[PDB]
Amino acid sequence: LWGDQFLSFSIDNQVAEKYAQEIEALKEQTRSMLLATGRKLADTLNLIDIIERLGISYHFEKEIDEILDQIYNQNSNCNDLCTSALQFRLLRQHGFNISPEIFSKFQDENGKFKESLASDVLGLLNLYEASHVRTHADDILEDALAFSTIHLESAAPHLKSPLREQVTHALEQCLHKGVPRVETRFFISSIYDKEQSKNNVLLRFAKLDFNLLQMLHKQELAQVSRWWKDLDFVTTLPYARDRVVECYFWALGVYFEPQYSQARVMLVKTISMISIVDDTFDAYGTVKELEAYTDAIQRWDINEIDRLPDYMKISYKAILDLYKDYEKELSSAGRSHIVCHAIERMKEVVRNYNVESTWFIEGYTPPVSEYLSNALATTTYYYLATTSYLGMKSATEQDFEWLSKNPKILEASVIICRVIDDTATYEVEKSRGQIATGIECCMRDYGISTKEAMAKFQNMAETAWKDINEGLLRPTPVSTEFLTPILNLARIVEVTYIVLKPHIINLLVDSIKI
Ligand SMILES: [Mg+2]
Ligand SMILES: [Mg+2]
Numbered sequence: 481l482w483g484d485q486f487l488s489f490s491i492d493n494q495v496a497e498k499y500a501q502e503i504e505a506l507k508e509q510t511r512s513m514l515l516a517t518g519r520k521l522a523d524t525l526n527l528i529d530i531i532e533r534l535g536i537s538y539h540f541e542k543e544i545d546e547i548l549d550q551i552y553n554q555n556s557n558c559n560d561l562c563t564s565a566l567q568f569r570l571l572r573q574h575g576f577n578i579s580p581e582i583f584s585k586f587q588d589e590n591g592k593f594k595e596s597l598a599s600d601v602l603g604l605l606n607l608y609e610a611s612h613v614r615t616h617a618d619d620i621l622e623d624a625l626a627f628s629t630i631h632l633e634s635a636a637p638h639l640k641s642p643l644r645e646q647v648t649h650a651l652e653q654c655l656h657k658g659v660p661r662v663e664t665r666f667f668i669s670s671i672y673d674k675e676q677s678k679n680n681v682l683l684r685f686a687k688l689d690f691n692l693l694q695m696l697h698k699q700e701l702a703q704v705s706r707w708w709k710d711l712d713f714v715t716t717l718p719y720a721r722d723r724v725v726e727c728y729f730w731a732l733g734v735y736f737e738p739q740y741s742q743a744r745v746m747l748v749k750t751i752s753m754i755s756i757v758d759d760t761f762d763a764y765g766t767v768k769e770l771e772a773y774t775d776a777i778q779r780w781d782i783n784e785i786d787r788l789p790d791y792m793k794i795s796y797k798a799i800l801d802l803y804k805d806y807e808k809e810l811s812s813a814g815r816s817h818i819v820c821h822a823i824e825r826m827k828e829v830v831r832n833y834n835v836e837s838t839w840f841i842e843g844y845t846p847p848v849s850e851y852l853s854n855a856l857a858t859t860t861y862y863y864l865a866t867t868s869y870l871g872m873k874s875a876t877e878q879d880f881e882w883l884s885k886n887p888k889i890l891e892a893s894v895i896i897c898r899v900i901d902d903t904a905t906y907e908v909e910k911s912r913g914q915i916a917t918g919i920e921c922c923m924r925d926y927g928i929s930t931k932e933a934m935a936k937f938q939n940m941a942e943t944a945w946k947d948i949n950e951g952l953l954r955p956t957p958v959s960t961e962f963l964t965p966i967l968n969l970a971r972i973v974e975v976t977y978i979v980l981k982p983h984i985i986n987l988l989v990d991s992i993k994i
Contacts, residue, residue, distance in 0.1 A: 482722070482725045482984075485989075486698070486701050486702055486705050486725065486988075487702065487705055487706065487709075488702050488706070489695075489698040489699055489701070489702040491695050491698075491699060496692060496695055499688045499691065499692040500692065502684075502688060503685065503688050503689055503692065506681060506684060506685035506688070507539055507685065509681055509685075510531065510536070510539075510540070510681065510682065510685055511539075511540065511543060513527060513681075514527065514528075514531075514540060514543045514544070514547060515543065521551065521556055521558055521563065521567070522558065522562075522563045524547060524551070525551075525563060525566050525567055525570060526566070528544055528547065528548070528570060529566060529570065530672070530679070530682060531544070531682065532544075533655070533663070533664065533667040533672070534664065534667060534668060534672065534682060534683075534685070534686035535660065535661065535663075535664030535665075535667075535668070535686060535689070535690060535736075536682075536685055536686050536689050538737050539689075544574075545574065548570060548571060548574050548576065549576075551567065551571065552571055552576040552578060557582075557585075559585070560603065561586050561597055561600055561603030561604075561606070561607060562600070562602045562603040562605075562606050563606075564582050564583065564585075564586070565583075565603065565606035565607040565609070565610040566606045566609075566610070567582070568580070568582055568583070568610050568613075569606065569609055569610040569613055569656075572610075572613045572949070572952075572953075573613055573656065573952070575952055575953050575954040575956065575960065576953075576954065577953045577954065580614075580617075580618045580619075580620040580621055581620070583620050583621065583624075584620065587620070591620065592623060593607075593623060593624065593627045598631045599635075601632070601635050601639065601643070601647070604627075604628045604631050604632050604635075605628070605632065605646070605647060605650060607624055607627070607628045608624075608625070608628035608629065608632060608650060608651075608654070609650065609654055609655050609656065610624070611624035611625040611628060612625070612654045612655075612656040612657060612945075613656050613949050614946060614949065615946050615949045615950045615953075616943075616946050616947075616950065629651065632647050632650070632651060633651060635647070636648055636651070641674060642670065642671045642672075642674040642675055645670055645671060645674075646671050649666065649670075652978070653974070653975075653978070657945070657970075657971055657974045658971060658974065658975065659733040659968070659971050659972060659974075659975050659983075660733070660736060660968070660971075661732060661733070661736045661987050662733075662975060662983050662986070662987065664686075664690065665690065665986050665987060665992070666986075668683075668686050668687060668690060668992055669992055669993075672686070684994075687992045687994050688994070690991075690992050691991045691992055691994070693736060693737075693738065694987070694988070694991055696738055696741065697728075697732060697736070697987070697988060698988065700728070700741060700744055700745055700748075701725070701728050701988060703745065704724060704728060704745055704748050704749065705724055705725075707749065708722065708724045708752065711798060713756065713794070713798075716791075716794050717756065717791055717794055717795065719759055719760075719763065719764045719791075720755065720756045720759045723752065723755055724748070724752055725984055725988070726980050726984070727748050727751040727752045727755065728744075728748050728988070729980050729983060729984050729987070729988070730747075730748075730751055730864075730972060731744045731745075731747040731748045731751065732744065732987065732988075733968055733969075733971065733972045733975070734747060734864075734868050734965050734968045734969060734972070735868070735964070735965060735968065739873075740871065740872065742809070742871040742873075743868060743870065743871025743872050744871070745871070746806060746809070746867065746870050746871040747864070747867050747868055747870075747871065749802055750802070750822070750863075750864070750867045751860075751864065751867075753798065753799055753802055754826065754829065754860055754863065756795055756798075757795065757799075757829075757830065757833070758833070758860075760773065760791075760792065760795060761773075761833045761834070761836075761837055764791070765792070767837075767841060769788075769789055769792065770833075770834055770837055771834065772787050772788055772792075773788060773792050773795075773796070773830070773834075774830050774831060774833070774834040775787075776788055776792075776796055777796075777799075777826070777827055777830040778827055778830070778831070780800070780823060780827070782797070782800055784796075785797060799826075803819055803822075803823060806819045806822070806870060807819050810870070813873065815873075815875075817877070818869070818870065818875065818877065818880055819870065821866050821869075821880045821883070821884065822863070822866050822867050822870055824884075825862050825863035825866045825867075826863055828857050828862065828863070829857055829858065829860055829862075829863050831857075832854045832855070832857040832858045833858060835854045836854065836855070836858055836916065839854075839916040840913075840914055840915075840916055843915055844915075844916060845915050845916055845920055845921055845924055846916070846921055847921065847924075847925040848918075848921050848922055848925045848926075850921075851916070851918060851921040851922075852895075852898070855898055855902075855918060856891075856894050856895065856898055857894075859894055859897040859898050859901065861890075861893055861894040861897050861969055862886070862890065862894060864969060865883065865890055865893070865965060865966050865969060866880070866883055866884075868965040868969075869883065869962065869965070872961070872962070874959070874961060875962065878958075879958050879959075879962050882957055882958050883962075887951070887957065888947055888950075888951055889947065889948055889951030889952070889963060889966055889967075890966050891944075891947070892943075892944035892945070892947035892948045892951065892970070893944070893948060893966045893967070893969050893970040895940060895941070895944040896941050896944045896945065896948075896970045896973050897969070897970070897973045898918065899918065899937040899938070899940045899941045899944075900937075900941055900973050900974075900977050901918075901973075901977065902917060902918030902919050902937060903918075903919065903934050903937050903938065903977075904977045905917075906918075906919040906920075906930070906934075918937065919933045919934060919937065922936060922937065944970075945970070948966075948967060948970055951963065951966075952967065
């Protein structure tokens with residue numbers, strides 16, 4: 481419902497250059513802040529936390545890492561909940577397996593959190609955020625979420641602004657599980673901007689940087705929108721909607737940095753394309769047509785097009801063409817040889833789409849284990865994760881080989897999307913006759929109520945998050961650069977099922993008022 485609002489974006493080079501020039505000054509100035517010698521732990525942690533929440537930490541990957549490494553190594557006891565929880569969270573998010581023992585001093589000989597901390601809002605907030613980065617080994621943090629949650633909920637109504645808005649927001653969306661750009665936009669405009677103790681250099685820096693990057697995101701969105709119009713699916717395939725803007729939001733959620741410009745464009749096209757296919761199997765193709773389509777996809781030829789009805793011929797050709805473009809784009813860098821990994825994942829998605837169709841027609845309700853073996857791939861997550869690597873100039877063959885083994889971190893990301901999707905779309909899918917819905921299989925397989933089935937599904941998502949958190953800890957199998965996209969895919973789930981309009985507006989329409 482966007483229209484020609486994004487067909488084309490004429491970037492006024494003057495404003496961009498001004499922004500860039502000043503950003504360079506602010507960047508160097510901020511760098512010097514990070515390298516300040518005589519700073520206290522609390523101050524150093526808050527500085528890093530602020531730069532990250534402001535969405536400008538990508539400029540200081542090395543600096544922040546070296547500083548955090550020093551903090552990890554010195555193991556200093558801060559003694560106060562606020563700093564301890566923050567220290568724990570930042571180290572964990574950066575792969576440092578800091579021991580949860582740092583929380584023992586805030587617990588009774590029973591391991592329960594000293595209820596006396598219940599009046600320490602700042603400590604509770606940082607503990608709340610830290611509880612979301614826990615692993616299966618962090619037994620000490622078992623009751624951290626419930627503890628901080630109940631007390632923050634109680635204190636919230638009487639807190640000053642913007643602290644109150646920060647707490648209220650956190651309770652609805654924790655930092656660790658939120659989409660980066662979405663959380664950055666919120667922190668900048670709704671919190672830091674209204675913070676009495678704000679650092680003006682950092683705020684100015686954050687605003688300019690966000691706005692400048694937004695211009696690039698707009699060029700990409702415009703470029704891809706033109707690409708979509710050329711395909712002219714609107715008239716040739718009147719059963720699919722112009723979801724391009726939504727598809728772009730997803731790509732933006734996976735990575736927003738300027739270096740991933742090519743990657744985002746490639747990713748958007750894939751998301752758009754597979755969306756067409758999903759529509760085909762869901763409400764247009766007949767039993768026979770779908771079987772013919774699944775086969776054509778597995779063969780991946782073109783001569784197979786003759787066995788497909790006209791509408792499917794358009795889709796099929798476009799898909800094959802898209803991958804040819806990908807191969808061409810990567811030719812200059814000699815990376816075209818990796819595209820096959822994405823194709824293999826697409827074939828997988830289509831096979832499982834077909835199987836899902838078959839299950840629906842037969843009225844089959846498989847046990848959970850069997851349901852998942854097919855339903856996990858239908859989320860398209862393995863496929864999208866593989867696709868995100870295509871445009872990443874550093875993604876080597878080894879990285880793709882690791883990804884093909886279905887790494888636990890990827891598996892967890894996929895599971896999160898699956899169980900959450902099933903919990904949300906259950907009602908709609910049931911009234912549609914889809915008795916092969918995750919929640920349905922769960923109920924029958926275990927012999928439990930819908931409520932209990934959904935509760936089990938939520939537990940699976942929780943378990944998966946802990947797995948993701950563990951998968952981020954050093955030593956990582958591949959560079960962190962390749963783990964973030966998977967983590968971001970899981971974050972997108974949290975945002976899509978708490979719909980995209982407000983985020984699209986805040987991220988791609990409205991700039992932050994400087
Ligand atoms: Mg479908
Ligand atoms: Mg579903």
